Ligand binder design. Structure first.
Ligand SMILES: *[C@@H]1O[C@H](CO)[C@@H](O[C@@H]2O[C@H](CO)[C@@H](O[C@@H]3O[C@H](CO)[C@@H](O)[C@H](O)[C@@H]3O)[C@H](O)[C@H]2NC(C)=O)[C@H](O)[C@H]1NC(C)=O
Ligand SMILES: *[C@@H]1O[C@H](CO)[C@@H](O[C@@H]2O[C@H](CO)[C@@H](O[C@@H]3O[C@H](CO)[C@@H](O)[C@H](O)[C@@H]3O)[C@H](O)[C@H]2NC(C)=O)[C@H](O)[C@H]1NC(C)=O
Ligand SMILES: *[C@@H]1O[C@H](CO)[C@@H](O)[C@H](O)[C@H]1NC(C)=O
Ligand SMILES: *[C@@H]1O[C@H](CO)[C@@H](O)[C@H](O)[C@H]1NC(C)=O
Lengths: 99, 236, 90
């Protein structure tokens, strides 16, 4: 059974628009890499002190709509947003896969 | 070309004047390309393709003249041959060779098109665009992504743009792959585009010089030459 | 026309011949010559010919200004083969 909510990612860079930048990033092989860190609670009498990381890779996806072009259109990157029982604070670090 | 004494000069006029009924009048070379198995010569009196190069039979190249309906002598003097320089050494089964020819014309009742392309046995020359109108400066077949790239420039306007269209059964299609990239209005005149050999880099040149990574959805200017145009390019 | 003895669509279907280059200014100087002969019972040795004669020049795309074709008018071949005289009528 799934978590609610996804993380949706794009990037913006001055001088160009977002959609063609995402199209170029997909066409050149780039894929976001996401690292989630969870922070423990104050109540250590009810939860344990352990601190957890999870490393994921964002999946490309198309935006449903008119899409005049044949193949590619508005494009975004998506990953699930997981949360564990015992925390309310998570740090999400996004970086590139090198390509 | 390390010595001028070893560059041997040949005249081919007898072989050309064979295929042409009578005898016309100004057979200069206009362009020539050398594919992996073929020799394509565009001269002022027409376009000729060698039969093949891997099978010697008569110790003389036999050239077959292509058909173009009407195009006369004034249509061949303004004509360019575009070819992607790619080495097919061990010749995998999926690798083929294409050649594009581009004229500058008026649209007669006998033609319509001014841009043709053909596959490895250079016999069936079919048009590059199918069913005000833009003029195709350069059409290039890219095999990494199986697509065709057009460099359009509508006359009576400064508008210049590039369209990438998917290929269906070896023939380019309508409905571009991704929305076209429009160059700025300062781009005075384009003169062509080139693929760097054995690579996936695109280079549009003319009054300015632009480079594109990936397929050609996004470009980035690297040079501007006000009222000056590059005429030719050499790369290795 | 396609044919006249086999009606299919109650509308004449016309096919356009190929002539390489000839433009509009060469069709305005052109004549169709036909021998008026009645083939009623259609013996097997009787065929029909049509000649077309043009008043144009001699491009690198053609050479001839005189063509003739047989009863299915699809293959138009020149009337004279290999200063040069002009054929008014063949
Ligand atoms: C790249 O991602 C950003 C955010 O991750 C996207 O920006 C968001 O785009 C939407 C358009 O659907 C904006 O929504 C608009 O909001 C206003 C007010 O809520 C509403 O009146 C509009 O009708 C529309 O719904 C949203 O504000 C905007 N967010 C930010 C922070 O700019 C962007 O669209 C993505 N790029 C691509 C190419 O998908
Ligand atoms: C926070 O801790 C609670 C307590 O364990 C977690 O909730 C529990 O999750 C399990 C499995 O998802 C639930 O079991 C299932 O319940 C349904 C509903 O009756 C039943 O049909 C299934 O066969 C299965 O037994 C359990 O009910 C649920 N606890 C409560 C009180 O509803 C929760 O997942 C933890 N939070 C996170 C983010 O993991
Ligand atoms: C088209 O025709 C006009 C005049 O009819 C001529 O000036 C022009 O050069 C022609 N176009 C090309 C590409 O030559
Ligand atoms: C060839 O062109 C000339 C004018 O350029 C014209 O007088 C003549 O009619 C043409 N040739 C013939 C014999 O039809």
């Amino acid at each position: 059974l799934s978590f609610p909510y996804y993380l949706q990612i794009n990037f913006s860079c001055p001088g160009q628009n977002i959609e063609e930048l995402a199209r170029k990033g997909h066409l050149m092989g780039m894929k976001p890499m996401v690292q989630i860190n969870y922070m423990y609670s104050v109540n250590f009498y009810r939860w344990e002190m352990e601190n957890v990381q999870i490393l994921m890779e964002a999946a490309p996806m198309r935006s449903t709509g008119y899409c005049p072009a044949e193949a590619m259109c508005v494009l975004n990157w998506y990953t699930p947003m997981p949360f564990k029982n015992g925390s309310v604070v998570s740090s999400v670090d996004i970086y590139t896969n090198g390509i | 070309f390390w010595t001028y004494k070893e560059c041997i000069w040949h005249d081919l006029t007898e072989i050309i004047y064979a295929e042409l009924k009578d005898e016309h009048q100004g057979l200069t070379v206009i362009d020539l390309v050398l594919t992996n198995h073929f020799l394509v010569i565009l001269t002022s009196l027409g376009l000729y393709v060698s039969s093949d190069l891997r099978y010697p039979t008569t110790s003389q190249i036999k050239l077959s003249r292509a058909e173009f309906c009407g195009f006369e002598r004034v249509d061949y003097i303004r004509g360019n041959l575009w070819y992607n320089e790619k080495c097919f050494a061990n010749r995998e089964s999926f690798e083929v060779d294409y050649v594009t020819i581009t004229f500058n014309r008026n649209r007669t009742l006998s033609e319509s098109s001014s841009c043709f392309f053909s596959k490895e046995p250079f016999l069936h020359w079919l048009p590059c665009v199918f069913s005000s109108i833009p003029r195709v400066i350069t059409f290039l077949i890219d095999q990494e992504t199986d697509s065709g790239i057009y460099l359009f420039n509508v006359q009576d306007t400064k508008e210049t743009y590039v369209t990438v269209a998917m290929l269906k059964d070896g023939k380019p299609s309508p409905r571009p792959k991704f929305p076209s990239f429009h160059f700025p209005s300062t781009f005075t005149l384009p003169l062509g585009m080139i693929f760097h050999p054995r690579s996936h880099f695109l280079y549009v040149y003319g009054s300015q010089i632009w480079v594109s990574m990936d397929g050609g959805n996004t470009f980035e200017m690297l040079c501007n030459l006000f009222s000056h145009h590059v005429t030719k390019t050499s790369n290795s």
